[PDB]
């Protein structure tokens, strides 16, 4: 009776790494460069920073 | 003396017997 062998596993306890909260941080830097009001560029750097 | 070589032969099968009963109950006490 060496049982713990099984043991009905141990497919984890799964205090795994797949976490996003760890959070999504979706840095949204909308660059509006205007000209005298007139949008030339939206240089909108989405940084997806998961934490 | 003559009767006690077939005696000894049957105390062999008791010694035998003793084995088998080792060997059987053992097959019924089992594993993880």
């Given at each position: ?45 989405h940084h997806d920073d998961?934490? | ?32």
């Open positions: 009776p060496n049982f713990s062998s099984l043991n009905l596993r141990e497919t984890n306890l799964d205090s795994l790494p797949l976490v996003d909260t760890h959070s999504k941080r979706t840095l949204l830097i909308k660059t509006v460069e205007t000209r005298d009001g007139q949008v030339i560029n939206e240089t909108s750097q998961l934490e | 003396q003559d009767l006690l070589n077939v005696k000894m032969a049957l105390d062999i099968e008791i010694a035998t017997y003793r084995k088998l009963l080792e060997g059987e109950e053992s097959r019924i006490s089992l594993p993880l």
